[PDB]
Design a binder for this molecule. Sequence first.
Ligand SMILES: [Ca+2]
Ligand SMILES: [Ca+2]
Ligand SMILES: [Ca+2]
Length: 637
Amino acid sequence: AANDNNVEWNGLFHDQGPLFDNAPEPTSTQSVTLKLRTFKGDITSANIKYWDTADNAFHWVPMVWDSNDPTGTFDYWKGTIPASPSIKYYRFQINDGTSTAWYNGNGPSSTEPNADDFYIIPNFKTPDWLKNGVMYQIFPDRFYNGDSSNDVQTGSYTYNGTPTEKKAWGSSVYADPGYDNSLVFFGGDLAGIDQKLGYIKKTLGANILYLNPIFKAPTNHKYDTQDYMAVDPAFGDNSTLQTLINDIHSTANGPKGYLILDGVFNHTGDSHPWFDKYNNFSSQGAYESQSSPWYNYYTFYTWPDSYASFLGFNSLPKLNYGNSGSAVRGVIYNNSNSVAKTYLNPPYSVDGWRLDVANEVDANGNNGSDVTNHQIWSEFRNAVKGVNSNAAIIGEYWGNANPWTAQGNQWDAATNFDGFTQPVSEWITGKDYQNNSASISTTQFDSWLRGTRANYPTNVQQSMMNFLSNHDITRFATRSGGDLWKTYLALIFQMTYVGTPTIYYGDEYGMQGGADPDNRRSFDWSQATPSNSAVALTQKLITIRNQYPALRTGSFMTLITDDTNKIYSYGRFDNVNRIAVVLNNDSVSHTVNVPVWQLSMPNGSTVTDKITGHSYTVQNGMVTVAVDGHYGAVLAQ
Ligand SMILES: [Ca+2]
Ligand SMILES: [Ca+2]
Ligand SMILES: [Ca+2]
């Protein structure tokens, strides 16, 4: 490069990883020093342009040359945004004589962008264990039956007229005639999770457990809460939960573990005593009496039979959050004995909440995504973080969750349907996550990923819950048509991408399943061994991620987007390590010249492919690696 009236886009880089930003989670008193990479000698001037929410105006910080990289290929220019409490957004203007380029969260642009600026959110922290962890999601009825004495039997009880049905382990999940899919039980429980912690924490190596709902409720899914303050008897009692938590937290059985519970706060079940539609309690619920102590916890259009409910399901009456200081806000999060605080305080001390349909939570029967919804989650954050600043808050939302994350006042992160599950599904399987036809190329995949990362502050990106499948979509292995190699590829991407890798129980061995309820099959402990190739790969990949901070909190740089050969390569890198991931999404093998010079891997240095164990030497800026179809290499130094 030279001063030639031309900014060379391929040399440009910035993100908020360690090489480029000295304070990615600054306080009010920490200034933010930013570095912008260019090719050596490429430019004449560069400027940081930042919007300051303190004065609703743009501010200009000229950059200065700072240094070269060790290979002598690049310059770094630097400038500092001053310390203050205010949220700020920034982009770069980059000039080489008569050539100008702009650069922000969406990368380079010839014209000045008006969206996707980088974020500075003073005093906003997401928990570092969440950024650095690997999560395992368990739907508790279907994982392991550690105690047969608590099992729901066929006809143990009835709910809204229908008796319960028990199934043998391994059998089909669908309800036989006279029964209901929501009242089918296999007997999985908290004792079972506890007894299989070795598998989770050592055989795989995941350090975060996320459970679907575990509180008293009549269904197998337990989103229709009857008692938030009791573990459902089928799963155990509150002492069983305490034991499970102690064993998760223990460092004597593997790494220190964390537990995230499913917080179902938009609605209760119709059998909750506050509502009590079937008269299961001597108290008078809102359905039973307009003088009920809890009458104003719900919203009636025509009392008693027409009320606000989740997706119009009469079994899920919607909670009325009212105004600040309301009794409902009290019982859910403000009170010390609230649902949220009870489990965060001793003697439970759980590590976070996954917020079910969190966008819907509101007052007056409204459907959220509004001022009141956001106010509620701001209060919720204060409540949660006041008890435990390292308790995680992850909201369920299927789109761009910017409105609940990018002011640093609400969630730490969200369920990454839009930025992970969907684009991974369409790239690898040619299906959307509901198993309908929707395919994207590699260039499209890369673009989709970048634009969705740019929706979020960096700490939030790093804390996103990144799952291949979950309890509300079709299984990845069904979308893949049973091709185990498509799972291998998906796992390698998952374990080296930005955000918390989250394994939906059984995805690590290739479990199949269509729509709900078929995405909740029981777990096979024989198929759950290193003899299954996907399980062995998962263990290896978790070990790799845990070895390299660059994979969890490093920069992300696209290296190759090859639509001909279906090769995607990207780098993860920080001050210590440089890692080039090379993915082959074709059905045939390809030999790839990986441009590791882009990560400043020096000529003559070596990398190891952590997938196979083979070593390679860097020559003329390149590493040449052969990659099987639907597979990948993780070239680390
Ligand atoms: Ca130039
Ligand atoms: Ca059981
Ligand atoms: Ca009653």
